[PDB]
Design a binder for this molecule. Structure first.
Ligand SMILES: Nc1ncnc2c1ncn2[C@@H]1O[C@H](CSCC[C@H](N)C(=O)O)[C@@H](O)[C@H]1O
Ligand SMILES: Nc1ncnc2c1ncn2[C@@H]1O[C@H](CSCC[C@H](N)C(=O)O)[C@@H](O)[C@H]1O
Ligand code: NA
Ligand code: NA
Lengths: 332, 332
């Protein structure tokens, strides 16, 4: 395989994103979950032009997403099973999210690199979370995508740290709270507080009650730039600080330090950037955080610098059976 | 390597397109072609913010495109060498092309599949070639990208067909003419006519001179929906009909039919679609043709239909060592 074909496949990655977006957004996987279906039925049920849908499905089937079981009849595959709606490991929200506003923001990453102006803010006229707070459907998609990402790695975080000492667990910017839920499931003596923006914390609470897992979890709606809940034994910032530049991260951390009792601990759960040139998903997420939020992933030394500015000291960086690390800090 | 990670890497293909686009557009490969350079110097020369450019470069370095030779110093790799400007195998124009209007048009592929409305025309308010004729920088990029792709497959076409019987070879919509040039190189006694829009035919002369065939190859500007040049021994349509719907393709073919002499041959060089589920670049290019042009790749049976409507009969479909096939037809 010539180098030119390797590079061409890289350059054309956007085709894959959008072709999978089409299949995800139309909900094809749900329609073929029981048995393969003819193209005309799939088109009719999804509101697509049959010959055009056929072309999209043939193309992604060639990389293992759906399969043409007989001419004009399409079935599910292992990769397409992840695009079903409402299943425990669904990645449908992720496929949807990456084909919409985030795709468009990324059209201007060059301008962002040249000027420092956050690409999403240029494209849509306000901050990422400010935008989502105005658009409930996009908000739902983001929160479900984010929760699906974290749900899949939560077990690895729980296997990597002893949570026994903590009876009150405060998750700051918890989203829909899959990691908090996993911690509570594993520690039957613990109670949790799921802290987020009011609209997110309200929806998270209903999701917990629905799933019947909110007995020892309460929700609090607030603003971590103003204050966070007091008296927790551990404060968890999971996939949170990489949303914020240094100035804003320091603000969050100082509010955590204010609220925390002196016996409390701080846990940062994130894709800590390694040394060297090996492949790492966090190197790519780092650029996504640039485009959307004007933020970044960080090295251990960068966290140390944030901690010194916020009244914390790094205790240790614990690895996990995922890309994530736990950065443990103590109040000083 | 969990399935969920495989699918996430597919969904995030757009990040790769855009990150390579930044490095290509800024011209980093030319800056480091002869020796590695520190990020400060790269930032200064390109008008980029150093910390942000460093992040992009270290991310693409982790997939083999550039290398961090020491901290904050970057050098070339074989994949990044393909992003240099003006080199014989340059893919710089392809990387630029795919990150700009074509990327933005692909944001609307769902709507195109739902409604049949061409995504590029929705996004830009005009046809693809109409846009390019008014945007010189994008036009040069397109034409150089297209010629670079075709150059890498031209030997496979010439190897698959004996061009020795033809005294005059006419290439309809030839662009900058790399296939025509390969044909003429292979047959020193042959004369060529390159036909394209006036602005393209005008620019092609310089490329034909560089290719060493300029002394034997005329450049004719015009519109193939009106007329094409008469009396050629063979008329070549290479990566041409896939730009046009059936009706417009028939218009082109009928003009070729009335220009052609009775002993003439028609050769269509295209990514003819196969029936199975194997990987095939033409499956992806077929979607690209939808998005940009409201067009398609075709099967042999589809070409027979067009030929019946335009006074031609299929003679043979010849395979090549590339994805391309040669559809040979005769006037009836
Ligand atoms: N000012 C603010 N106050 C509280 N929460 C905020 C906030 N600004 C953003 N957030 C929340 O920060 C979260 C970032 S996403 C991280 C979600 C989750 N902790 C996980 O591990 O996946 C979102 O749920 C968002 O609503
Ligand atoms: N109406 C028209 N008349 C003449 N050429 C046209 C045209 N509309 C589009 N084209 C040309 O059709 C070409 C399509 S791209 C194919 C280029 C080349 N044959 C190759 O093998 O790569 C472009 O060069 C474009 O300028
Ligand atoms: Na296709
Ligand atoms: Na762009």
């Amino acid at each position: 395989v010539p180098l030119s074909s390797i590079l061409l496949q890289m350059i054309t990655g956007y085709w894959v994103t959008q072709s999978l977006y089409v299949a995800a957004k139309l909900g094809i996987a749900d329609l073929v979950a029981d048995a393969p279906k003819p193209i005309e039925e799939l088109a009719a049920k999804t509101g697509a032009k049959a010959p055009l849908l056929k072309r999209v499905l043939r193309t992604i089937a060639s990389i293992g997403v759906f399969t043409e079981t007989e001419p004009g009849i399409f079935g599910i595959t292992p990769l397409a099973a992840l695009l079903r709606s409402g299943t425990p490991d669904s990645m449908r929200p992720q496929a949807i999210m990456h084909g919409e506003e985030q795709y468009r923001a990324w059209a201007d990453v060059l301008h962002n690199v040249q000027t420092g102006e956050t690409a999403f803010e240029k494209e849509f006229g306000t901050s990422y979370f400010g935008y989502l707070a105005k658009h409930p459907e996009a908000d739902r998609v983001f929160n479900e995508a984010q929760a699906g990402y974290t749900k899949q790695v939560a077990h690895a975080v729980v296997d990597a740290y002893d949570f026994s000492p903590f009876k009150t667990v405060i998750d700051i910017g918890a989203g829909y709270g899959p990691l908090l839920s996993a911690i509570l499931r594993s520690q039957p003596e613990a109670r949790g507080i799921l802290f987020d923006q009011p609209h997110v914390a309200q929806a998270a609470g209903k999701r917990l009650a629905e799933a019947g897992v909110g007995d020892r979890c309460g929700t609090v709606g607030g603003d971590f730039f103003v204050e966070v809940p007091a008296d927790g034994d551990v404060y968890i910032l999971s996939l949170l600080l990489h949303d914020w530049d240094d100035q804003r991260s320091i603000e969050i951390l100082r509010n955590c330090r204010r609220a925390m009792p002196a016996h409390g601990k701080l846990l940062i759960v994130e894709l800590v950037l390694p040394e060297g040139e090996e492949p790492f998903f966090g190197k790519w997420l780092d650029l996504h955080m640039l485009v959307l939020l004007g933020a970044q992933e960080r090295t251990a030394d960068e966290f140390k610098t944030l901690f010194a500015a916020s009244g914390f000291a790094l205790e240790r960086v614990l690895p996990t059976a995922s890309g994530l690390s736990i950065v443990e800090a103590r109040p000083i």
